[PDB]
Amino acid sequence: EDPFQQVVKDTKEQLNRINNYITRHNTADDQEEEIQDILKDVEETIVDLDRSIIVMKRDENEDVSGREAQVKNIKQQLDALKLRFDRRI
Amino acid sequence: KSLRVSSLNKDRRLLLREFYNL
């Protein structure tokens, strides 16, 4: 919807897509470089979401607690995924 | 198959643009 919500949605979708892939190829791979590149891009995307929250928080007419909870959730999704990725044997 | 989500990079740039409107 707003640019922030769109990126949130794209990021969860992007993480979910790799997660589905890992389930189907859980052995240690064609997409190995690709997955590393996308995960690093996701890291830097979350930094952008956090900066965006920082600036919005300056506006006393904004409550960023909903956005903060969405970013925390994405970070949890990313952390769970990174471990799955790392542990393919 | 590509794992990449379409419009992800476009959407990030729109975020950063918004970031400089604020």
Side-chain angles (χ1 to χ4, degrees), chain A residues 42-52 54 71 75:
Chain A
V42 165
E43 262 185 53
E44 293 184 350
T45 305
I46 291 164
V47 167
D48 292 342
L49 296 167
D50 274 338
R51 299 151 76 228
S52 152
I54 293 170
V71 176
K75 290 169 171 171

Side-chain angles (χ1 to χ4, degrees), chain A residues 6 10 14 31 34 48, chain B residues 1 3-5 11-12:
Chain A
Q6 192 59 62
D10 292 345
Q14 180 63 87
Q31 302 267 191
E34 185 84 335
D48 292 342
Chain B
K1 283 160 190 174
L3 293 177
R4 300 177 176 262
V5 173
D11 293 344
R12 284 190 69 186

